[PDB]
């Protein structure tokens, strides 16, 4: 067999440089790379694994049918160990088939409906493939999607709490679909954890992506942008001025039940908004964003109570449940009690007189805790400016920049 | 510090599983620990994560969810009844013994802050013990209590280095 001697010929080429030409023959396929090599594949990985083992798997998951025998469970076990001990920098030179391998694995787990074993797989691959923790790869979308199908939101938090500033070119490919998927599945993840402040931020980034045609993954982000903004803020926030023109001309007309919902959510009237929700209920349940409109119902009552603090200082419970349409002093008693615990209002309930007194005196700025709070905001801005200066300096030393 | 050392020990065990499903007692511990930390959203998602087949197999898991449903509605007088409707084995029992205290202290803080006057009937259902607090609270904690009308009246009870960092940044 000439293949066995050829393997040793690869060894003498490696470890003495010539890394560029090594990748040259990798992209030359190899006629399925002798897929029946599984018997000798165990001993093929000499030393502490090599890059060649990663190349072959990337091509035999795309057989378009029956990828890796009914024995997939056996192979996936070796794949799990492969990522955990591959090591080295050889993978970074080939950041086009590792991501492709991750896409094939993500597709496999989705069809078999087991989106929990791949969470521990697409968590160390990202950790070493990216240059730094602030670089967005094409595997972030897959990891967020996997933890979204099987609901384990906590593991994906460390990869959503960091501000992405770079996008991996991945040796070509990397279309806008992967970028939108990360900033849309991240929005769902934050929405589930009831973090609407950052969920709104993620949906906005997807909308502002430059585009020339309507996509299915961007259509259901303007819709959720409105609902999240209605829950967190009192109204629909204004989109950035540099948004793509496709959203203003094509995306908006399809999303007309949500726009009408915003129109009703401008004059406070829960009864009217209740009718619209039950009228367009078929649309809100088809898009699977049901249970995010029911929260808009609750938020209307809480917004109106938060407005009573702008005009009143002591209000009877019976009188309070007449402007907000709560229909009962007992119902209004628990609504206020819930809001105090959340921190959305400062008030105290006097059950003897059946009154609610709105304190509206949270804190004076004379605390050492507030001094530390301001300092924490200082360090975020100071360190953010440093990374802006660093990326600015690299522009100055660019050979293209100096010419003009 | 000692308690935190045990918290993170159970976290990773669910992630690595031979087939994506862990042993039943591991599932139950995570759900009960979520209740103790008041993290209701992840507790609800964990219940949705458990496959229906194992969910019906072990009714011990359902007992945790019935208690979790009450605390999800913030039904203070109702959680104390659901925590005793079922009997938990000694392997999970100490965790419930700490959730009950956490709920008890949570009601005490909420009443003292969100209420200026509360009926003794309602306050007892909140704190959980309508047994001996009726007479002990008058003289020890100092809260004046009036009978007949049953009204309780809660009462309220190194830098130089940082500064030179700011200037060294601003001037450069």
């Amino acid at each position: 067999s000439a293949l066995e001697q050829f393997v040793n010929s690869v060894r003498q080429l490696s470890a003495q440089g010539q890394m560029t030409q090594l990748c040259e023959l990798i992209n030359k396929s190899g006629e399925l790379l002798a897929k029946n090599l599984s018997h000798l594949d165990t001993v093929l990985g000499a030393l502490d694994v090599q890059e060649h083992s990663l190349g072959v798997l990337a091509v035999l998951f795309v057989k378009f049918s029956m990828p890796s025998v009914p024995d997939f469970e056996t192979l996936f076990s070796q794949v799990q160990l492969f990522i955990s001990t591959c090591n080295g920098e050889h993978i970074r030179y080939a950041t086009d088939t590792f991501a492709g391998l991750c896409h094939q694995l993500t597709n496999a787990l989705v069809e078999r409906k087991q989106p929990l074993r791949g969470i521990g797989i697409l968590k160390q691959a990202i950790d070493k493939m990216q240059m730094n923790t602030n670089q967005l790869t094409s595997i972030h979308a897959d990891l967020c999607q996997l933890c979204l199908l099987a609901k384990c939101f906590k593991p994906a938090l460390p990869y959503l709490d960091v501000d992405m500033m770079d996008i991996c070119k991945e040796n070509g490919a990397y279309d806008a679909k992967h970028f939108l998927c990360y900033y849309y599945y991240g929005g769902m993840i934050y929405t589930g954890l009831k973090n609407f402040e950052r969920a709104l931020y993620f949906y906005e980034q997807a909308i502002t992506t430059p585009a020339m045609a309507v996509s299915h993954i961007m259509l259901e982000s303007y819709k959720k942008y409105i609902l999240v903004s209605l829950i967190l803020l009192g109204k629909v926030q204004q989109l950035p001025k540099y948004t793509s023109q496709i959203v203003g001309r094509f995306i908006k007309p399809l999303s007309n039940a949500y726009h009408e919902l915003a129109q009703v959510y401008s004059t406070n009237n829960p009864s009217e908004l209740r009718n619209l929700v039950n009228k367009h209920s078929e649309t809100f349940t088809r898009d699977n964003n049901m249970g995010l409109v029911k929260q808009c119902l609750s938020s209307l009552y809480k917004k109106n109570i938060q407005r009573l603090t702008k005009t009143f200082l002591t209000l009877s419970l019976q009188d309070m449940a007449s402007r907000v349409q709560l229909s009962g002093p007992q119902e209004a008693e628990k609504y206020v009690l819930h809001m105090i615990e959340d921190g959305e209002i400062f008030a105290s309930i006097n059950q003897k007189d059946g009154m609610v007194s709105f304190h509206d005196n949270p804190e004076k700025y004379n605390n050492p805790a507030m001094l530390h709070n301001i300092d924490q905001e200082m360090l975020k801005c100071i360190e953010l400016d440093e990374r802006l200066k660093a990326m600015d300096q690299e522009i100055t030393v660019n050979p293209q920049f100096v010419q003009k | 510090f000692s308690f935190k050392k045990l918290l993170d020990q159970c976290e990773n065990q669910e992630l690595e599983a031979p087939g994506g499903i862990a042993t039943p007692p591991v599932y139950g511990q995570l759900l009960a620990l979520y209740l103790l930390h008041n993290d209701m959203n992840n507790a609800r998602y964990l219940w949705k994560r458990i496959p229906p087949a194992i969910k019906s197999a072990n009714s011990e898991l359902g007992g945790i969810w019935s208690v979790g449903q009450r605390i999800w509605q913030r039904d203070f007088p109702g959680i104390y009844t659901t925590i005793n409707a079922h009997q938990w084995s000694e392997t999970v029992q100490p965790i419930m013994e700490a959730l009950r205290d956490a709920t008890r202290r949570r009601a005490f803080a909420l009443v003292s802050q969100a209420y200026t006057s509360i009926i003794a009937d309602d306050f007892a259902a909140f704190v959980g013990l309508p047994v001996e607090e009726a007479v002990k609270g008058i003289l020890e904690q100092g809260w004046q209590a009036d009978s007949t009308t049953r009204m309780v009246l809660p009462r309220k009870p190194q830098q130089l280095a940082r500064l030179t960092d700011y200037v060294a940044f601003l001037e450069n």
């Binding site: 300096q393 100055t396 030393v397 050979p399 100096v402 | 060294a168 001037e171 450069n172």
Partner: peptide, 24 residues
């Protein structure tokens, strides 16, 4: 102050070197 000044002069030194090279 010395660190910031050194980095500022280091960038200015590098840009001038590549500028002089192609100036005949």
């Amino acid at each position: 102050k010395e660190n910031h000044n050194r980095t500022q002069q280091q960038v200015e030194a590098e840009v001038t070197n590549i500028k002089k090279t192609l100036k005949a």
